[PDB]
């Protein structure tokens, strides 16, 4: 294989360059399930493989790193994904998480509500989203670009992701947004990553690596999602938990990446090159301050 010993599979570049039409997603191993190590939750395995993959990219990893995790809760009321992120991230990393539904978490701070209500004074070095509405999986209806939390995420990236920062946003066959794909063209590099433990699902993490704040490439998100589905439809991925058994190199290396505050007029080509290499973060280094808008209503 080779592939089975990886944490998962990233979309091959040649698929990204196609001009496919959107088809239904029919996965060969649709019903298979990976055999997880004893007592390990699917979400722990999935986030572990995601982070193992992110370790191979040029992530900026500054001191006083700031990470926000959307969709972090679970029907069990805990946050397995946040627990993996906090294990992965350097000690002292500030980690905020959030979900529509209540849950208890190891994050430094948690906000409960619709993500559209969330505001932050500060910019972020990494944004993780597992938000998902299972009502989108409706094979009887056309598969159009979805708005809702994807609209929020696109604006949140453009307003609050530090230059040099990165994102991993969960999508599926039916949970996707064309503007989010278009925004992948504003990073030095991007992919769609499928975990090997969840390879029987149309889920992937859309990863934008090193944000540039402007388009490097003009991407048609409708076509690109069609390209992603075509890749999945024609490339069965063998379910695998092999990578979970080797955790010796798991922690993200604290690279001490430089943080500078700069005005837009100062972002020259040399800065852009540094940003594209994982060697610079541009943002204020002020305090992390968050809030959630609360709708007030009467019943009397």
């Amino acid at each position: 294989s080779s592939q089975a010993w990886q944490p998962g599979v990233a979309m091959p570049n040649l698929y990204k360059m196609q001009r496919m039409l959107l088809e239904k997603c029919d996965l060969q191993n649709y019903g298979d399930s990976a055999t997880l190590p004893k007592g390990i939750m699917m979400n722990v395995a999935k986030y572990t493989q995601l982070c193992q993959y992110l370790n191979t990219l040029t992530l900026a990893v500054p001191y006083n790193m700031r990470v926000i995790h959307f969709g972090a809760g679970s029907d069990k009321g805990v946050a397995p994904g946040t627990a993996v992120l906090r294990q992965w991230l350097p000690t002292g990393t500030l980690l905020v998480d959030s979900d529509l539904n209540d849950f208890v978490s190891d994050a430094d701070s948690t906000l409960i509500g619709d993500c559209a209500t969330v505001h932050t004074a500060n910019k972020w070095d990494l944004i993780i989203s597992d938000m998902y509405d299972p009502k989108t999986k409706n094979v009887t209806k056309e598969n159009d670009s979805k708005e809702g939390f994807f609209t929020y995420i696109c604006g949140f990236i453009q307003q609050k992701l530090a230059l040099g920062g990165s994102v991993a946003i969960k999508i599926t066959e039916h949970s996707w947004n064309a503007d989010l794909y278009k925004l992948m063209g504003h990073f030095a590099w991007w992919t769609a990553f499928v975990t090997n433990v969840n390879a029987s699902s149309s889920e992937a993490f859309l990863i934008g690596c090193n944000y540039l704040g402007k388009p490097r490439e003009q991407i048609d998100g409708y076509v690109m999602h069609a390209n992603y589905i075509f890749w999945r439809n024609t490339n069965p991925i063998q379910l695998s938990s092999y990578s979970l058994f080797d955790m010796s190199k798991f922690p993200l290396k604290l690279r001490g990446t430089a943080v500078m505050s700069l005005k837009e007029g100062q972002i020259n080509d040399m800065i852009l090159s540094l940003l594209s290499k994982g060697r610079l973060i541009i943002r204020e280094n002020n305090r992390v301050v968050i809030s959630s808008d609360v709708l007030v209503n009467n019943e009397n």
Partner: protein
């Protein structure tokens, strides 16, 4: 004043044969760690499982105030090592046992300080 005694309730419930709190978040790790009880990253040794701390805290999981004037949680945001023999009930374990303030190991499950 009246205050619910959540710890006694879980302990009595267990003795009565109630099923231990589940969905404690177990971590993947090398199992070559220090073996200390409560750490900033997973530190299970070969005889332990490491869990996300919040999910093993009775007060966190049951949405009740922490038994601390400050309301500060000992486990949230950290990782708790549970002997593999007791990992069916991480919440019961953390509740019924105590960490040595000198070596950081669980009293009776790693603490060798009275030797």
């Amino acid at each position: 004043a009246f205050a619910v005694d959540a710890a006694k309730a879980y302990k009595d419930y267990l003795a009565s044969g109630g099923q231990p709190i589940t969905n404690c978040v177990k971590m993947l790790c090398t199992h070559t760690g220090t073996g200390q009880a409560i750490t900033v990253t997973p530190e299970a040794n070969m005889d332990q499982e490491s869990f996300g701390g919040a999910s093993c805290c009775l007060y966190c999981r049951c949405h009740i105030d922490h038994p601390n004037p400050k309301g500060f949680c000992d486990l949230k945001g950290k990782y708790v090592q549970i002997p593999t023999t007791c990992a069916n009930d991480p919440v019961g374990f953390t509740l019924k046992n105590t960490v040595c303030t000198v070596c950081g190991m669980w009293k009776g499950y790693g603490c060798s300080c009275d030797q």
